[PDB]
């Protein structure tokens, strides 16, 4: 991971993070 | 084979008797408290009689050297000869001289172990799954030629997992498991 500049699978890096855009797209200007 | 190592082998041929009686029993030194042994030594064939105290049931083992084997069943025979070999070999009834330099069973380093039944095996397999599809973890390995595997042998029950009760200085006893891998 260090060689390729990736986040190690340690601590906070032990999980994978996503963003749910559902609520943003249900809002109208 | 000599007049001393047969006395050491007699103790292994009490754990084997116990496993013959009940394939899921826990094996350790204390088992020896339920048996008595009689030995008749001879340079060609040694006779070892194992007797269960409460039941008074007998089992007779015939011990031969590897070079000269002349086996004929007798009354209450175990049903298979016991062979002392020069080097480690596959087979639950073959023991190398290397295993019999000392009184192995009563040493503090002798393990405490058991065979898992189907329910416990299913539980263990379920615990190893990672929860992501069908991926799973793997247990540490042990060879098929260890004396533990020889003691835990049954013709019609394959052995894949062995459970160990480790001595632990802070908790007393700890549970661990190993998987058995074949030897070519």
């Amino acid at each position: 991971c260090h060689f390729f500049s990736k986040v190690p699978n340690i601590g906070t890096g032990y999980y994978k993070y996503f963003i749910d855009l559902g609520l943003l797209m249900r809002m109208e200007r | 084979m000599n007049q001393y190592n047969v006395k050491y082998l007699a103790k292994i041929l009490c754990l084997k008797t116990e496993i013959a009686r009940d394939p899921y029993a826990v094996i350790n030194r204390n088992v020896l408290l339920r048996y008595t042994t009689d030995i008749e030594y001879n340079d060609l064939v040694t006779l070892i009689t194992v007797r269960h105290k409460i039941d008074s049931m007998k089992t007779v083992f015939q011990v031969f050297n590897e070079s000269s084997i002349n086996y004929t069943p007798v009354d209450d025979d175990y049903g298979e000869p016991i062979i002392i070999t020069s080097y480690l070999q596959k087979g639950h009834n073959k023991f190398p001289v290397n295993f019999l330099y000392i009184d192995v069973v009563i040493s503090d380093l002798f393990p405490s172990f058991v065979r898992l039944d189907t329910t416990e095996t299913n539980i263990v397999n379920s615990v190893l799954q990672t929860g992501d599809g069908k991926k799973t973890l793997r247990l540490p390995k042990m060879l098929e030629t260890e004396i533990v595997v020889k003691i835990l042998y049954r013709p019609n029950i394959p052995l894949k997992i062995v459970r160990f009760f480790r001595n632990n200085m802070v908790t007393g006893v700890e549970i661990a498991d190993r998987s058995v891998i074949s030897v070519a």
Partner: protein
Amino acid sequence: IGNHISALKRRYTRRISLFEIAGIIAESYNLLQRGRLPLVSEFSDETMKQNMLHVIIQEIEEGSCPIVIEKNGELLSVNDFDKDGLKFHLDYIIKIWKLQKRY
């Protein structure tokens, strides 16, 4: 017997520690700092005069945090974890943030 163990493990998945909440806050804070739209109720021009960490905590508490985390083969939002554990860790974090003059 396998299904019972699987159910027990699925329940075990819902407990929360410092690493997970810290990671969630870090992701949300990075996105907000770099310019995403806050998702708080009663959004108005007075929202931009507040502290960003206050906004992040409010989003978490009212159930509109957009971050999703993958833990044991499942995808969880911040509100799928045990409620008491979330309160426990958030209380500790807010205390130490106040000591640092952040909150």
